Amino acid sequence: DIQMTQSPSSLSASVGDRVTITCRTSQDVRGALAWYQQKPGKAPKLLIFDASSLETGVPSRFSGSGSGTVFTLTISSLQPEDFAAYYCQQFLDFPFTFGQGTRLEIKRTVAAPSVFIFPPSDEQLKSGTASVVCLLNNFYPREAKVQWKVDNALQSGNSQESVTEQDSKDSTYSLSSTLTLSKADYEKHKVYACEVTHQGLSSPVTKSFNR
Amino acid sequence: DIELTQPPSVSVAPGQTARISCSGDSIGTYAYWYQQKPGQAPVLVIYADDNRPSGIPERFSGSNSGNTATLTISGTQAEDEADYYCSSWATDNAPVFGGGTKLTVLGQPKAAPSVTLFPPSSEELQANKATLVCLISDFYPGAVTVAWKAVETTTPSKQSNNKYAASSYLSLTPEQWSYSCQVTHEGSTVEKTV
Amino acid sequence: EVQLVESGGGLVRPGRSLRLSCTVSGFSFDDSAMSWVRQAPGKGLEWISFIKSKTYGGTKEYAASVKGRFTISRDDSKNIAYLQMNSLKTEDTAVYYCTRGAPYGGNSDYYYGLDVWGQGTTVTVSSASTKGPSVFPLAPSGTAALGCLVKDYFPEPVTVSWNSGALTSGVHTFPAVLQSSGLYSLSSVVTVPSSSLGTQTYICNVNHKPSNTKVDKKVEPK
Amino acid sequence: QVQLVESGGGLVQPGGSLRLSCAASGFTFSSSGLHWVRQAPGKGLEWVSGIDSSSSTTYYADSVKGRFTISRDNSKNTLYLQMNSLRAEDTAVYYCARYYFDVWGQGTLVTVSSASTKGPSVFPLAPSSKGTAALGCLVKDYFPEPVTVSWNSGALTSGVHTFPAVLQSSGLYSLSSVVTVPSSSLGTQTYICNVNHKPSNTKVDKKVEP
């Protein structure tokens, strides 16, 4: 097969600037790449064809370049339209593999998140499943690390992480961490806390709950 | 490469399924099926494994597994009778074609063909020529085997009465000119003495 | 214009056959190549199968991940493309797209792109049955956090309303998470002033359409 | 629609030369290669020649290798197959088909026969046995037919079944016409066989008697 790497997955840009997205190939595709744009939760669209040639229905801001192994998309002015996910696909020999994908996020000032610790549910205490909810609202950049520390010891393998998409108004993010602990596990621990590592945060701020 | 092995003829009752197999020596790829009405160019009914082109009714369905392919004609109609050929692509990128199968739908009741013998003619004897004439008429279905007992036999042809007919011509020298003709239509064997 | 629709997507237990149909209208189906692209929720796009037109033999061929389990067929008379999957697995839970591979020139064997994409249908592979949502209050222990935890959601898409739909600003609905058991987990976040926390009656409305179950929960300080 | 028409085929002497032309309409010729398929009479299809779309390579059947050449005149939207040193059994109808065999043309008849216009020999074949009897005449060495055989100069129309012609190994077609008549009328009905050899422009009259 042909390996397909897109660099970097997360690319940050402001409105009206220039954006480069690079698709790198293993062998030489002979100028037969196709660039696709996917808006969130909707069908992907054909953006750039035969490497350089532009497909009908796309304005002039989108362009392609390069041949052989390196291929790039240059966008002249980034509109609100087009802030989405971009994919590249190979068309030399079967199979038509897709790249990892590149996500375009609106550039914004570095804002630290707000740490909210949701205590264990009183109704869910007798249900049989005990959960601890950590909520981070208004966090920028998308990358953040949440560590579930129980009794001063980090817990791993029992956490589910969810991320909210960029808000259409302020362009922020939300992060939710759920720690799954049984009734015996919930009772055994003494102090449960979550440690948040963010670019805005100077030190890891941890909020603890008392059983 | 050897041609794909196919049954010579298949008999199916009207409104009842038809099964044709295309087991072959390493087809290795997808098997296409073709339909040939006599006197007409072959047309495609099944391509790849079980795809159907436009203009082909749903009654044609296909399958492929291992080294065998099958055309399933569910509820065949009388007008459908034709020769079905299966083709595939070998490793050398050269097409290979199958022998073919005839869909003998039993539209009419089965009947034993009538055979008329023909001894040598007086003119042929005077001219030193011998011709054993075996005319098999009123055959159903149109598939008869002609044998000579002591030889060019025409292929079966549809008769004006809807009964298959055929002729068997045997050449013998005037010196060598009893002669018997054997006819086998469907299991039964018909023998005529001359 | 050119329209592609899909069907056959639903809940299927592991190891059971399911057939998707791609109805094609607005353009000629005989001479166009059809490909299926799947997108796992959250993950990237994955290319599943490709079948060439009738003019080029209709050579079906698939990626290494689905070879031996996915068979693709097409009928030109009813302009419909079929994808059949046997030995279905939990990793195949995704959204499947029907794509038309446009030829290089008018008609050529070199394919340059997938031009028109269908809206897509959701194929879910799971063992659990339809379970009603479970509402767990998350009481607020400047801006306070009030929310409800949705646990044990089965075979579904759910709607969360804050203040019976009155509170629209500051409502953050997290994406669904596939729990280990087989149910979905959802979270709702409401940010309100601390003083207003004890005044407004924060009412959460959760509707589980597949189960026809409506759950209402109240978030109050503990 | 995609339509193919082939022509240029006819009866030739063994070892002669023949060129068959395919006309293509509705699809770009340079996009797809074309195949030649031959149908021997009394038998199924057989692959003869193949050409890739770009004329990059040419695939030939082993039974015809070294004798047939196939060129694709992409300029005039035509496909040509050139035949030299044909042998006897190569007689068939040649079909011109698109690569992967999607569309087939009507086909062209190519006959390899050293025989020329030869008059038939009306050897009588009367019913030697016997309520009804079958009698008629046999036309031997008719080249190439269709030979019109009539009973009583067209007077008799019921009971006369004309068997299809047989392509004997001698290269001359043979025909047999049999008339089924009652046994009592064998000595009364005038059994007259008239043969009109259209290819040879010969009208042969024969008399059938008990």
Numbering used by the authors:
A (entry chain N): 1 to 211
B (entry chain L): 1 to 150, 159 to 185, 190 to 206
C (entry chain M): 1 to 141, 144 to 224
D (entry chain H): 1 to 130, 135 to 214
Give sentences copied directly from the paper behind this entry.
RB1, a monoclonal antibody (mAb) that binds to site IV of the RSV fusion (RSV F) protein, is a potent and broadly neutralizing against RSV A and B viruses. Methods: In this study, we isolated two anti-IDs, 1A6 and 1D4, targeting RB1 CDR regions, demonstrating that 1A6 competes fully with RSV F in binding to RB1. We determined high-resolution cryo-electron microscopy (cryo-EM) structures of RB1 Fab binding to 1A6 and 1D4 Fabs, elucidating the differences in the binding mode of these antibodies to RB1.
Interestingly, although 1D4 anti-ID interacts with RB1 via both the variable heavy and light chains, they only engage the heavy chain of RB1. There was no commonality in the interaction of RSV F-RB1 with 1D4-RB1. Conversely, 1D4 only shows partial competition with RSV F in binding to RB1. Our cryo-EM data for the two complexes, when superimposed to the RB1-RSV preF crystal structure, showed that while 1A6 shares the same binding site as RSV F to RB1, 1D4 only partially blocks RSV F from binding to RB1.
